[PDB]
Design a protein around this nucleic acid. Sequence first.
RNA 1: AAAA
Lengths: 368, 367
Amino acid sequence: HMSHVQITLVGGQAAPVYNGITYYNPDKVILVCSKQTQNEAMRIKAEFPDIAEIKVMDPVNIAEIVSETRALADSMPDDEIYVNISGGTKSWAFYFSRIFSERSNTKIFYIDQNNTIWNFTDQTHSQANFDLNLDVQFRLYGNSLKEYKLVSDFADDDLTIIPKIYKIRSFDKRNFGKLMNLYSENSENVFFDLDNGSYLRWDNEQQLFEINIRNRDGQSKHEILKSTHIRRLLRNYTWLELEIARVLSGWKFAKEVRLNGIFRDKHENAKNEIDCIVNLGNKILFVECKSHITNITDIDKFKNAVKVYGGSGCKALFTTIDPIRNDALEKCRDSNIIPFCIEKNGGINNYKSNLFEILEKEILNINP
Amino acid sequence: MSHVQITLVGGQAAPVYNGITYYNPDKVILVCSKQTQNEAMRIKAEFPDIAEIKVMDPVNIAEIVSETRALADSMPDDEIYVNISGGTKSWAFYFSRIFSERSNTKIFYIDQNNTIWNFTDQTHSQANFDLNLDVQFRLYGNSLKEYKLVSDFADDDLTIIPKIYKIRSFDKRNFGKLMNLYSENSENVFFDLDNGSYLRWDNEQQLFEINIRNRDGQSKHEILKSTHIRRLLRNYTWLELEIARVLSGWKFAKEVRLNGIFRDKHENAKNEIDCIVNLGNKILFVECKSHITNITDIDKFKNAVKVYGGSGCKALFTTIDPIRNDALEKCRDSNIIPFCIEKNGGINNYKSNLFEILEKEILNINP
RNA sequence: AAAA
Ligand SMILES: [Br-]
Ligand SMILES: [Br-]
């Protein structure tokens, strides 16, 4: 009987190549790559080691493309051929689609960033009936997130204390920020203070944080901060990343939420920390979280991490408590990053619906 | 008959612009989506009297076929070329087929080397023009209004570079800490460390006096004097100048800019770029450091290259000191060319190795 | 997956 053979073009993005094999479940895969995309091709082959093989070809030279594409076609019996032209250069797509459409049992297809499979031959479409696995996608893009947290790694009192930390901080942001930075830099000390009287004290007996914030008018806000993992929450604004992960966890489009991930190199040296990663099923949402932006080139770091770990199909969200300055906003538009400021969108107890609305307007768009 | 060009507008404005410049058509149809409308408007601004914009869904076959067939039918007697370089594979598939139903239609594609590929005839030719840096930046939405040239420096700024490098080599950390103290409080005249190293400005003789101690009881004392030595010793400006200088002599460089700043709409800085090289058919961006301290500087650099120059640029990260394995992996992640001067022949003999590495990469198409 |  006729075999099902998929010829698929490997560009920079491994995701649509992998997704097209997963959808059609082919009997045999021909991965067409260049010298620049050969590692991507090898990572894809490693997910289907028994059926896939690799053909290397120059990405733009027409003389070679036509000659080697005819050679490939000459080597293939009359089977059911499907060509995924999603990846690879326009040059490959132009000639693969034409040469293989000379056979009556050939379908040319394309899978978009929403996991809609478009059959270009029959002018039909259908939807992929599978969800992305985050660990598979990172591996396909060369990496593994071996370190991270779930919202369920945190107790419920870690979640309920979040509005209180936020309120205390708003009594005087600069003093809160300075104390938090001193705590995060020497978290093994027990007492941190400013000259104006602000302080943060750790009480190991009561498993408790006693904090005092001074404002510019000389008033004090003196409160306690007690939760199962409060020592972790106050390190580097982990509580803020937790808050975003918790609320996205309840979002109708989220299938899985991971928090405080670290991507390492082949020698276990850290390459990037990621605040929050949401599995949307047909794409990944990355999230960077800050109290406020100080170094606006953090926006550049963030966008590059997103492209490196998840590829060009991902969405990128940058959340802050504080209003974002115009230079940071323009950089967000430059990089196609969704900016979100909590205090300007309802505050800590009433931002959820605005955030969901902004994401849902973008979730189905195809990234240029 | 008119020469109409229909061109697909993806995220990259350069192939669209370059395709129009090459053929010089009487009429341009910029086919874009709602996601690439800004790109289309910026290309139209360069051809405002001949180009119009048509908005299309990027992937919906039924809409694309209907609206592409209507567009085609709306120009019965015209010679039409179609640039399928930009835009989705969906557009490329149906635009190429629907329009090649006419004998006065050529489908073409321009690659990142500015080679024009005529897909209909299976022929190629090379663009007869060179990149302009300011048009390209404008197309991608920015302006480099601030930058220097190598010629803005003096001859004795160029000859003192190896002396500086060699002084640093005597003890890199001690040199580094004096340089940091200087770069922060430039106006002070004496900087010193507990171990005896010092940097001193002599206002009468208009020179620096520097003394670097090592870890074996010895010291290197020298004079540093050039036209702009005070600027050169700030934030390793001398290193950027050195790379800018050598790239100025490279046969593939058409034009070299250093210390550029891209700013937002209120003149606040978005990125500083150490060195920008016009190669005629693409741009090379350069980042210079004595040594990498925060390896996520590689991420920042790469995104700036994409934002300002596009996906067809080359990116070079040069250091003095060895680039460690974690930094090298990140450069691989980001398709950045790493280059360590010390490991490639030192400050006087690295040119050949550096030109060799760039020349292998220069003709490759970036994925 | 929208000069790959
Ligand atoms: Br804890
Ligand atoms: Br095509």
